[PDB]
Design a protein around this nucleic acid. Sequence first.
DNA 1: GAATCATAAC
DNA 2: GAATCATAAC
Lengths: 195, 195
Amino acid sequence: SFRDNLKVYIESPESYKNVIYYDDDVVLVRDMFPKSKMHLLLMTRDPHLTHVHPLEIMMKHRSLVEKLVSYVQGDLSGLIFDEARNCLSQQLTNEALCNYIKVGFHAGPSMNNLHLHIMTLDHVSPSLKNSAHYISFTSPFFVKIDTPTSNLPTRTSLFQEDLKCWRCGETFGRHFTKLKAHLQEEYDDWLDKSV
Amino acid sequence: SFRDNLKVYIESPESYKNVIYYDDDVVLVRDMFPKSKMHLLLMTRDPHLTHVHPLEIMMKHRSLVEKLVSYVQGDLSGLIFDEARNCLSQQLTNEALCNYIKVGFHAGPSMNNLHLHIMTLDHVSPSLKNSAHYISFTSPFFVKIDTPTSNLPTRTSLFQEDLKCWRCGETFGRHFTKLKAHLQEEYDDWLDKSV
DNA sequence: GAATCATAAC
DNA sequence: GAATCATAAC
Ligand SMILES: Nc1nc2c(ncn2[C@@H]2O[C@H](CO)[C@@H](O)[C@H]2O)c(=O)[nH]1
Ligand SMILES: Nc1nc2c(ncn2[C@@H]2O[C@H](CO)[C@@H](O)[C@H]2O)c(=O)[nH]1
Ligand SMILES: [Cl-]
Ligand SMILES: [Cl-]
Ligand SMILES: [Cl-]
Ligand SMILES: [Cl-]
Ligand SMILES: [Zn+2]
Ligand SMILES: [Zn+2]
């Protein structure tokens, strides 16, 4: 079903032009429907963990979490910063970008194969088309990779709540196209300040 | 009601920053929801014609039609080409642009105040959000300003028909997001060829 | 006209 | 997960 669509990337990464990196253990691929200017997925190729729910991963598979984090902060940081530069602006330094990138799992992923999101904060993107998209990346539904186990969520109902800017906290109620306009403004503001 | 929203531009053009030009007779204003990279409206300020249906205008008010056309081809051509350059690419010549602009009325306008559309052909725009938007500008629902009276439409049902590229005629059925992707490609192609 | 919400079918 | 269609309320 549609929930298995990511399977191809960990079985045959060598043939996908949207794949940025692969080895025996992981695959780093551009999201087909990016929810920010830059939006990547890092997927484990391990057949025994790819179907483990990301909350169970966080609770019980610390070694994988730490391996994922090591790729992002280490060997793949170059690729990731360069990709962000390709997607946002060519003259952004790594330092400028390091605090404009978030890394995390969805608490209730629609796809079966374990995928870690690596994306810029802006949420400026044509593929961001409804409130549920936004809330899923800016609420506790987005389980940041460094979340203490004692703080992991579970129960959602966040998707009926009011929209708030992730950067300044302005509320927009359920007015998603107002939020969209504001996210573009926040991004122009951040970009102008950062170059 | 919402059908009267354009009234403000012909009553108080002097205060709107989206107004490009006004005199006693007409107002040229940026559409708030542009359906192409460049999308302008030219509105008569005449109180006795602004509420005349555009098909009746074409049938019975040749002098207005011809006045509108004269503004577009003459005194406002400079503004219009410069605006297109601001919206598409700064190094496009007028000749390059003259055949990438269409001028016309909707056959069934949602707004009460007579407005002539002046827009680029691309239909590449975030405000183009559904098939009805597209069809309304690329089908006979779009009454080109130079349409012979003997060829004017009336009856619609075009809005249930299949989507076709205005530039090459490829059909997309009712797959609007496929059409969107293709319009972007057609535009990149046109732009690369034209600069 | 725009925009939010709900609903199939994949 | 995406996307088409329908439906209020402005
Ligand atoms: N690269 C890629 N990403 C996808 C595909 N299908 C869904 N996604 C994204 O994967 C995430 C699933 O939680 C969402 O961000 C989806 O937009 C796909 O076929 N390829
Ligand atoms: N400039 C402007 N255009 C509008 C407004 N409301 C609707 N339109 C556009 O006017 C046209 C009406 O047929 C459509 O292209 C609408 O998107 C408005 O308030 N201001
Ligand atoms: Cl680590
Ligand atoms: Cl929008
Ligand atoms: Cl004329
Ligand atoms: Cl799209
Ligand atoms: Zn803000
Ligand atoms: Zn085409």
